[PDB]
Amino acid sequence: NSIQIGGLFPRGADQEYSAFRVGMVQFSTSEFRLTPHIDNLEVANSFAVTN
Amino acid sequence: LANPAVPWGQGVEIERALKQVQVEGLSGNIKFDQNGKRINYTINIMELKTN
Numbered sequence: 001n002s003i004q005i006g007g008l009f010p011r012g013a014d015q016e017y018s019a020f021r022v023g024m025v026q027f028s029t030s031e032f033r034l035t036p037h038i039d040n041l042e043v044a045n046s047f048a049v050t051n
Numbered sequence: 052l053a054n055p056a057v058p059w060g061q062g063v064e065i066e067r068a069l070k071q072v073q074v075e076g077l078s079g080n081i082k083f084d085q086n087g088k089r090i091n092y093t094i095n096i097m098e099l100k101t102n
């Protein structure tokens with residue numbers, strides 16, 4: 001029961017990814033577990049976002 | 052979309068080629084700056100009258 005979820009964190013976002021991980025720790029359950037793939041990019045860049 | 056994206060060299064040359072253009076056309080004098088915006092244009096200021 002693996003759930004793949006993508007994620008996009010703007011370069012320079014630290015506390016956000018921290019709270020993301022903390023959330024991953026707190027809301028984890030025996031039923032299913034989220035399997036995040038984190039990608040840092042230039043959030044203002046449309047090409048980067050599309051890619 | 053192939054990552055990392057690689058641009059061709061020729062592109063810059065074609066860009067400079069386009070930006071260096073100065074021609075006469077329906078929009079009046081056509082010339083561009085380094086960034087590609089219009090320069091030295093003429094916008095006719097018009098008013099609607101009875102006739």
Ligand SMILES: *[C@@H]1O[C@H](CO)[C@@H](O)[C@H](O)[C@H]1NC(C)=O
Nearest residue numbers: 080082084089090091092093
């Ligand atoms: C062409 O544009 C440049 C940029 O402002 C300006 O300095 C120059 O006077 C313009 N030429 C004419 C004929 O308007």
